[PDB]
Scaffold this active site. Sequence first.
Site, PDB file in Angstrom:
ATOM      1  CG  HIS A   1      67.299  42.677 -23.734  1.00 17.26           C
ATOM      2  ND1 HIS A   1      66.465  41.628 -24.025  1.00 17.26           N
ATOM      3  CD2 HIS A   1      67.343  43.452 -24.848  1.00 17.26           C
ATOM      4  CE1 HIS A   1      66.027  41.749 -25.264  1.00 17.26           C
ATOM      5  NE2 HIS A   1      66.547  42.850 -25.786  1.00 17.26           N
TER       6      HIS A   1
ATOM      7  CG  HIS B   1      68.797  45.854 -27.963  1.00 20.59           C
ATOM      8  ND1 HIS B   1      68.403  44.551 -27.767  1.00 20.59           N
ATOM      9  CD2 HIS B   1      70.135  45.876 -27.746  1.00 20.59           C
ATOM     10  CE1 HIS B   1      69.447  43.815 -27.445  1.00 20.59           C
ATOM     11  NE2 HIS B   1      70.521  44.593 -27.432  1.00 20.59           N
TER      12      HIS B   1
ATOM     13  CG  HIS C   1      63.671  46.432 -26.708  1.00 22.56           C
ATOM     14  ND1 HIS C   1      63.716  46.707 -28.051  1.00 22.56           N
ATOM     15  CD2 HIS C   1      64.478  45.372 -26.508  1.00 22.56           C
ATOM     16  CE1 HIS C   1      64.517  45.841 -28.643  1.00 22.56           C
ATOM     17  NE2 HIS C   1      64.987  45.022 -27.730  1.00 22.56           N
TER      18      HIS C   1
ATOM     19  CG  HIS D   1      58.399  38.823 -24.695  1.00 24.39           C
ATOM     20  ND1 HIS D   1      58.290  37.542 -24.163  1.00 24.39           N
ATOM     21  CD2 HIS D   1      57.529  38.870 -25.731  1.00 24.39           C
ATOM     22  CE1 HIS D   1      57.396  36.858 -24.850  1.00 24.39           C
ATOM     23  NE2 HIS D   1      56.919  37.634 -25.804  1.00 24.39           N
TER      24      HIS D   1
ATOM     25  CB  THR E   1      68.543  39.072 -28.751  1.00 25.72           C
ATOM     26  OG1 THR E   1      67.660  40.100 -28.240  1.00 25.72           O
ATOM     27  CG2 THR E   1      69.828  39.713 -29.311  1.00 25.72           C
ATOM     28  CB  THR E   2      63.243  38.104 -28.667  1.00 27.42           C
ATOM     29  OG1 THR E   2      62.702  38.965 -29.672  1.00 27.42           O
ATOM     30  CG2 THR E   2      63.943  38.952 -27.592  1.00 27.42           C
TER      31      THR E   2
ATOM     32  CD  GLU F   1      69.242  40.307 -25.480  1.00 30.01           C
ATOM     33  OE1 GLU F   1      69.112  40.970 -26.531  1.00 30.01           O
ATOM     34  OE2 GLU F   1      68.550  39.309 -25.207  1.00 30.01           O
TER      35      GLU F   1
HETATM   36  N1  LIG Z   1      59.090  39.813 -37.853  1.00 27.81           N
HETATM   37  C1  LIG Z   1      59.334  40.633 -36.736  1.00 27.81           C
HETATM   38  C2  LIG Z   1      60.691  40.997 -36.440  1.00 27.81           C
HETATM   39  F1  LIG Z   1      61.682  40.542 -37.154  1.00 27.81           F
HETATM   40  C3  LIG Z   1      60.983  41.751 -35.288  1.00 27.81           C
HETATM   41  C4  LIG Z   1      59.932  42.263 -34.453  1.00 27.81           C
HETATM   42  S1  LIG Z   1      60.329  43.470 -33.179  1.00 27.81           S
HETATM   43  O1  LIG Z   1      59.722  42.976 -31.945  1.00 27.81           O
HETATM   44  O2  LIG Z   1      59.820  44.739 -33.485  1.00 27.81           O
HETATM   45  N2  LIG Z   1      61.707  43.525 -33.031  1.00 27.81           N
HETATM   46  C5  LIG Z   1      62.479  43.021 -32.045  1.00 27.81           C
HETATM   47  N3  LIG Z   1      62.661  41.722 -31.751  1.00 27.81           N
HETATM   48  N4  LIG Z   1      63.920  41.486 -31.203  1.00 27.81           N
HETATM   49  C6  LIG Z   1      64.558  42.627 -30.986  1.00 27.81           C
HETATM   50  S2  LIG Z   1      66.270  42.778 -30.476  1.00 27.81           S
HETATM   51  N5  LIG Z   1      66.397  42.297 -28.987  1.00 27.81           N
HETATM   52  O3  LIG Z   1      66.643  44.124 -30.573  1.00 27.81           O
HETATM   53  O4  LIG Z   1      67.104  41.972 -31.301  1.00 27.81           O
HETATM   54  S3  LIG Z   1      63.879  43.871 -31.941  1.00 27.81           S
HETATM   55  C7  LIG Z   1      58.567  41.917 -34.760  1.00 27.81           C
HETATM   56  C8  LIG Z   1      58.259  41.162 -35.916  1.00 27.81           C
HETATM   57 CL1  LIG Z   1      56.803  40.797 -36.212  1.00 27.81          CL
HETATM   58 ZN   LIG Z   2      66.600  43.723 -27.623  1.00 27.02          ZN
END
Ligand SMILES: Nc1c(F)cc(S(=O)(=O)Nc2nnc(S(N)(=O)=O)s2)cc1Cl
Ligand SMILES: [Zn+2]
Length: 258
Positions: free
Chosen positions: A94, A117, A92, A62, A196-197, A104
């Site tokens: 986007h 992020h 990471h 991703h 956001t994912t 985003e």
């Molecule tokens: N439950 C759970 C969680 F809430 C988050 C992530 S993560 O992949 O480390 N975190 C990300 N997922 N989305 C991200 S974002 N774009 O910063 O909002 S951070 C993994 C697990 Cl397993």
């Molecule tokens: Zn992100």
Amino acid sequence: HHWGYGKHNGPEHWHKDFPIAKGERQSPVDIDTHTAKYDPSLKPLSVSYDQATSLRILNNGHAFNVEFDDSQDKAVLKGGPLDGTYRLIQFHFHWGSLDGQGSEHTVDKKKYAAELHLVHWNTKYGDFGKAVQQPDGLAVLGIFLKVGSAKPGLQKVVDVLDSIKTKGKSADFTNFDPRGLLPESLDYWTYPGSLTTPPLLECVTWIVLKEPISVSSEQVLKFRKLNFNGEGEPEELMVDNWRPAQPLKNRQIKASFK
Ligand SMILES: Nc1c(F)cc(S(=O)(=O)Nc2nnc(S(N)(=O)=O)s2)cc1Cl
Ligand SMILES: [Zn+2]
Ligand SMILES: Nc1c(F)cc(S(=O)(=O)Nc2nnc(S(N)(=O)=O)s2)cc1Cl
């Protein structure tokens, strides 16, 4: 099948497996600078990354994550709208298929070429896993990237991308200093949101910096050479891995600056 950013498994499809997609505090959102209100109760924001310990870089299909050692308070985020200490676990980006899109969050509807992020979890909750079961479990520091001059502090990331071209690949990435990715000013906007994912958990206090960092066209281009797919599967360029702005609903965006 598995969620992604394609026409059949993209953002508009996530709600089917992840109901919260239509929740009350989803991210990202458009930042209406005129409607954002300065907040005096906001304490000075503290970004202490001098003791940061980067460990590895990985392609999760991703985006790519630079993970850090969060077994101790080494790189923490405090102050601002935050109560307590939050440890940096990973960061990471986007980005888009073109310079005109990729971020985003948006500012007055303006989209940037990409968005950084830096993810942190509230230490009061012991581990990242438990933190994502709390309304205030996470704090993500978002930084916009605009195309222009090269960002010295980002080149080390760019040059290692060839070693993690496909989903599942990872490479050692020690001694990387995230301070090289921060803009000059720490002026920001903050609001309660979510990841956001998928799983799109609403456990995030978002802190989005106002001043974008500038990166070179060639730096962003290398981001676009990455792959969503696995090594033995058909190639699908990792581009446009961003979720569009979601309804602000019953939320207010506060500014740390007047
Ligand atoms: N439950 C759970 C969680 F809430 C988050 C992530 S993560 O992949 O480390 N975190 C990300 N997922 N989305 C991200 S974002 N774009 O910063 O909002 S951070 C993994 C697990 Cl397993
Ligand atoms: Zn992100
Ligand atoms: N623990 C915990 C949590 F991590 C997150 C949410 S939530 O984000 O408000 N609601 C959802 N609960 N599951 C969701 S999903 N991924 O749509 O199935 S998000 C609620 C609770 Cl209670």
